[PDB]
Amino acid sequence: AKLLITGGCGFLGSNLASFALSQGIDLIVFDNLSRKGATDNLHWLSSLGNFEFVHGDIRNKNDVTRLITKYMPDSCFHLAGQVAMTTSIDNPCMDFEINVGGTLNLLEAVRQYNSNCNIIYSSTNKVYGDLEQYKYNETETRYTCVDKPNGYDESTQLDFHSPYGCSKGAADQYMLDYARIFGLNTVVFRHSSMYGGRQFATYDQGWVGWFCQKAVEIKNGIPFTISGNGKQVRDVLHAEDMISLYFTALANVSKIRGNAFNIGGTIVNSLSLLELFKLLEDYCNIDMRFTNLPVREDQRVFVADIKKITNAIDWSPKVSAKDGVQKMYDWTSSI
Amino acid sequence: AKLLITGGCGFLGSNLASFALSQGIDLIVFDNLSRKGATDNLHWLSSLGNFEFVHGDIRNKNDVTRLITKYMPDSCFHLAGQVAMTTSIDNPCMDFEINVGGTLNLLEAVRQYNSNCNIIYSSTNKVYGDLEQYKYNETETRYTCVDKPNGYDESTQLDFHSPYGCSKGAADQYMLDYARIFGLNTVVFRHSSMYGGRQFATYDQGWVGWFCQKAVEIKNGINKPFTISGNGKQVRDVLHAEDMISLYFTALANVSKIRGNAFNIGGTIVNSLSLLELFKLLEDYCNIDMRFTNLPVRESDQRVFVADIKKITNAIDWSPKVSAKDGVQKMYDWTSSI
Amino acid sequence: AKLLITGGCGFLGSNLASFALSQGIDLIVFDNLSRKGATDNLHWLSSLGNFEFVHGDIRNKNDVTRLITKYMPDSCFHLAGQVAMTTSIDNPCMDFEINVGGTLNLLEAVRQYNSNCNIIYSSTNKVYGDLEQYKYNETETRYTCVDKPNGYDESTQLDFHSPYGCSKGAADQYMLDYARIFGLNTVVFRHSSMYGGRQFATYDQGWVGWFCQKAVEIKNGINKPFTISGNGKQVRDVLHAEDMISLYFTALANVSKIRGNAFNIGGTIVNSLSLLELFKLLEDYCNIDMRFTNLPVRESDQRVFVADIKKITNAIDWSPKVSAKDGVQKMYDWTSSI
Amino acid sequence: AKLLITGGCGFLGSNLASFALSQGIDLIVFDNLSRKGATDNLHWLSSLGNFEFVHGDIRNKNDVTRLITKYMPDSCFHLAGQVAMTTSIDNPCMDFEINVGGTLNLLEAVRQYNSNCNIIYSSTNKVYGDLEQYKYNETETRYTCVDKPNGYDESTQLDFHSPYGCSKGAADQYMLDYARIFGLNTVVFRHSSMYGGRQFATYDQGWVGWFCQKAVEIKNGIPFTISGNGKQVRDVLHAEDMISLYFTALANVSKIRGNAFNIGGTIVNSLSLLELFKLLEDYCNIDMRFTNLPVRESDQRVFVADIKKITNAIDWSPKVSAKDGVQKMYDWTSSI
Ligand SMILES: NC(=O)c1ccc[n+]([C@@H]2O[C@H](COP(=O)([O-])OP(=O)(O)OC[C@H]3O[C@@H](n4cnc5c(N)ncnc54)[C@H](O)[C@@H]3O)[C@@H](O)[C@H]2O)c1
Ligand SMILES: NC(=O)c1ccc[n+]([C@@H]2O[C@H](COP(=O)([O-])OP(=O)(O)OC[C@H]3O[C@@H](n4cnc5c(N)ncnc54)[C@H](O)[C@@H]3O)[C@@H](O)[C@H]2O)c1
Ligand SMILES: NC(=O)c1ccc[n+]([C@@H]2O[C@H](COP(=O)([O-])OP(=O)(O)OC[C@H]3O[C@@H](n4cnc5c(N)ncnc54)[C@H](O)[C@@H]3O)[C@@H](O)[C@H]2O)c1
């Protein structure tokens, strides 16, 4: 079976590609090498096995259509995207072209030239908006949603906030609708935070890795900022848990096609920024000092209620936050 | 004030444009003349007064950008769109380009070059999906929604169905988010069925108007036997063009208070009709028999769509004044006039 | 056989379309109705026969590709374009998108899905630049090219001047290259001035028609004093629509022998006119005095443009039959009739 | 002064960028890293100085416009392009979007927001067509243009052959017209073959480099093909002369704005593929074995630039001999 990974030299993509390579799956990677680290990732993958690398711009309809027609993949992980909320605010046009435009270029090519292709799309918890319709409590280290003790499920109201939220949300709904109307085999994952090796976090994207870099410099002598008070919460999912989800879901596509699933590390793996700092301090014997910025354009809490996916395919995260965090630290140091 | 109406030669657009002309508001109309009857409306508006007509394609960024910088409108009703669900299924790329691409072209131009421009966007009831999460009952002439007897409000779950639903839904969310993020003055109306003069209905767009045309044909002994998709018990509240005009202008006048919000708009439960009920109204008014054949029900369809308008009425205290009976009679008269 | 005419509701297109209708050739007209008068031409054509009218934007790849796949025409006259040099200077982007992008949209659709389609493209004399490399003399009524007494042939050096010249020249070259590389059956006509019925001239396009309009007004006691750019001695050979119809259809009938070539097309030296000469003809025909004011010469201009048509006459034996004096009188009459 | 180089990680771009860094010029590099070796060139340049690297797609109007408004360069070398004729035949759509669309994206941004920007465009000899209107002569090793012993000048008829010729040609004419119509400071170079370090030749583009490679591959024990008989000729211009040409032309922009110039190694630096093969064989003590394919599309039998116009304008002239540059190219290639 042929597997195509758009954005294959990115964090998620490179991790998935490596599994594909280890499983002997014929792999096609499509990326523009725009993310700092993508080139390194590509070099690393090449050291793992042989595959087809196709440089291309997801925004370009011709590039995308030729990719599909030429390789006719059996399955595809559509990860090429504009990933930062901050950049979407400064460059909404690019964000729209990449996330909405790129997704539609892929959907149209698939529909017209390769309709049986199984597609998994990485959406976001931002399609849910600010989540201010619920009530929260504030403790010493974090906020808590009184109404949704175990996280939010797919029945949560859609309300796209920020251009990134609107472009991913539009792509999300089109993915789901192409399954209904045109019979495409699509699957949508509304993802909460992810972290792991091959992630080249930045100030604008990859909060967990970013703060690890923070803890790393501190360690080698190099205040930083935090948006808001640090008590905002996100469930954190390690790359190892993401790989299993992708491949397992792909293998069960016939059963789950046409649905969206909330994906995250779950309540047990929930962390506030403050809580994340503790952990790092405690591992590296350090002190993370910072200044405050106003709250971002932001969910006080985001925890996925994964009953849906668990029930469908029996997947659950095996990597705990503490564990994954130390490993993330180790990897960051490694750079 | 200068008012820009994109899709200004269409059904809603020309009605709104006529009002602007009568009230001395300076008008700019932008349209590509693609809708059959658009040329007729343009001609009709031209005889009503003077205004700036700008032929253009909303999908074209340069056309849109130049329009905004050149005229710098104070307000704008963004009505240009791909309006047929059917067409959206047959040509999803076109639907996406016009509805999403075109809306973003306008948003970007206003954001960058004329940020104070007020914008009202004509969205749809299709952003709510099939609404099968609710409970229904089937009566003799219609389907009734048991737990939402007065229609649906803005708290209904968004679930874009059909490419038309997806394109209008994406544009809808972008309009709301631009108010939030970039401070634009936008308003979104999620509309249910509208009908009235200047509407040149077709098989796949303007159900009330199309069925009125079927009646006119029958009345004149024209054999062009028709169909309905489903059993005809599906319901929609219908809103007359006169009420649509008052809503747009009233809303505009209160934009400062309503900016950044979406409102479900419709004729309300009292003006709702199933196709079977519409047929009866026509048979009574015209002294005819509406014979038809049933086709399978539509791919994407809502058994019932009635807007609960508490939100808009509470904000601007606008409410529909034209009854379904009265409006449909008027509509038949207009149709027969063509 | 099906014939597709892009730009089918314009001046050339409507004339060509009408002939197809009369000869019973299956016709598809593709147009966006952007040129004023396009709707009138469309209505007019509608009164001559039946055909498929497809509203669309040549700049839009999807509209163009669908058009080809859906109708699979056997021949096509590609006339949709941005025709004004002034507009090309004020909006080079649009000019480029229409003329280069639109032509490429068509070329690619044909190449991939209907490679046998014969295509005739209407290029321009502007691909030859200012022509200042030749020598000229000036008389009391016009300029004359002393080294090119029979006009310019296809051997003249290409030098695109103006964005219009650049967009049309790029399309022209692509048309010819697609015949070479991809084996398409293309023919390019580098046209000099054309005029005739169904042409709704404006200040910016259709100089002959424009000045005829000026004469009608004066005739009719109307005052809209006008201008000319430069001294009025600049010359153009003028070709009447009647000759143009025969050209296109005769050429189409001989495509196999002429595919992959460019031909200079015009009324020829015998039909060359300067603006001053044109005024004189009109004053005589109408018994009026044509007063005007002179403006600076247009930046991008040819003092003389006359087509040396030996190549096309040798290939298909077509030659213009309508003289300038006779054509202009006819044009005046058409103009007055409007 | 700020210099923006589009296609800055490519062969010409990296060479020009290194020089700029050496002169202490504020540099902006724009590239999508599509060419194989681009990432390598980006890494190589990185240690030469500080500069701004902007990843972007020239096809994308938004990327290009933001680039111009954000950096407001004083000068620009527009090298981002679809460089292969072959590939243009296989993907004319892409060739058109990159060469024509990309160039108009740049010209529009400059026209509207940074109109004094000086721009040098790298066009091609392919805008001249097949050149069959001339008379040739075959010798044992090459073809000769009987009517143009010193090469072709700017007065040669324009006739764009191949989609690449059409796309580059349209962009070339637009560059010149924006100068006349909009007062832009543009210069067009109709370039014949260039080669040197930092060039990552492929089957499709970079003939001298490609064959050097061919040379390397063999010597290292381990067939290749040639399109036509190998007697076709090109003048070859080394990277060193290209660098001087660019910077000198840029410095003299006020006097050459709005013009096109044919650029090449000149006749003394002309080579046929067969002659190049000797070069290597000797220089390498080897035998270059190949199979023949049909002649490339519209391929010119002879392309030698008559540089009188440019020499008269800025007195630039190539100083690197083919023998010399080719040997060094060989050396450089073997070193990779
Ligand atoms: N990592 C997370 O925590 C998280 C949270 C939710 C959603 N997602 C989604 O998962 C997907 C992958 O995320 P990631 O963390 O690996 O990000 P990433 O930036 O590391 O990977 C994306 C890859 O896409 C490539 N790319 C970007 N623009 C492109 C374009 N125009 N054409 C082609 N390729 C292009 C980039 O070079 C990069 O290698 C994205 O859609 C992201 O929005 C990730
Ligand atoms: N009338 C209803 O019952 C109803 C229901 C809900 C939503 N709407 C929305 O209200 C708006 C107006 O609807 P309407 O009934 O007046 O439709 P309409 O078709 O009569 O009006 C749309 C107008 O836009 C023009 N247009 C279409 N594509 C264009 C393009 N690419 N560029 C420029 N102009 C273009 C058309 O020529 C036409 O004049 C649309 O956005 C529609 O989705 C209408
Ligand atoms: N009339 C002349 O003297 C003359 C001289 C040289 C070349 N030409 C060329 O001949 C062709 C016909 O010119 P004409 O005089 O009939 O002009 P015209 O304007 O009357 O006809 C062109 C038609 O194309 C349509 N059109 C324009 N933009 C379009 C778009 N984006 N999508 C679809 N349709 C579009 C217009 O609505 C118009 O009906 C043009 O390519 C023109 O440049 C004409």
Ligand SMILES: NC(=O)c1ccc[n+]([C@@H]2O[C@H](COP(=O)([O-])OP(=O)(O)OC[C@H]3O[C@@H](n4cnc5c(N)ncnc54)[C@H](O)[C@@H]3O)[C@@H](O)[C@H]2O)c1
């Ligand atoms: N090398 C020659 O012999 C020669 C001869 C004539 C003309 N030229 C022209 O000179 C220029 C540079 O040639 P070169 O040999 O250095 O080629 P090159 O391939 O090494 O350089 C072009 C660069 O542009 C980048 N690029 C390609 N497509 C892009 C896009 N869509 N957006 C952004 N960047 C993109 C590539 O990644 C590459 O780094 C080109 O315009 C070429 O056609 C070169």
Ligand SMILES: Nc1ccn([C@@H]2O[C@H](COP(=O)(O)OP(=O)(O)O)[C@@H](O)[C@H]2O)c(=O)n1
């Ligand atoms: N440099 C940074 C990065 C992220 N953050 C915060 O980190 C939190 C989690 O990042 P996010 O919301 O973008 O992550 P996801 O929920 O998409 O995984 C947010 O409140 C960000 O504002 C921060 O304060 N400083």
Ligand SMILES: Nc1ccn([C@@H]2O[C@H](COP(=O)(O)OP(=O)(O)O)[C@@H](O)[C@H]2O)c(=O)n1
């Ligand atoms: N020719 C037609 C048009 C509409 N209809 C139906 O009439 C109902 C209302 O039409 P619609 O859903 O397109 O109307 P709106 O909600 O957009 O106003 C739908 O169930 C259509 O399928 C029909 O049966 N026959």
Ligand SMILES: Nc1ccn([C@@H]2O[C@H](COP(=O)(O)OP(=O)(O)O)[C@@H](O)[C@H]2O)c(=O)n1
């Ligand atoms: N209103 C007008 C229109 C054209 N003209 C001039 O008429 C001459 C012919 O117009 P043109 O060059 O656009 O015509 P073509 O050769 O493309 O048919 C040019 O010199 C125009 O500048 C004018 O002086 N006034």
Ligand SMILES: Nc1ccn([C@@H]2O[C@H](COP(=O)(O)OP(=O)(O)O)[C@@H](O)[C@H]2O)c(=O)n1
């Ligand atoms: N792999 C190759 C590459 C080029 N060539 C020939 O080399 C000559 C020079 O190639 P070219 O004109 O496209 O120049 P460059 O852009 O590669 O510098 C042409 O006649 C090519 O067909 C060849 O025979 N085999």
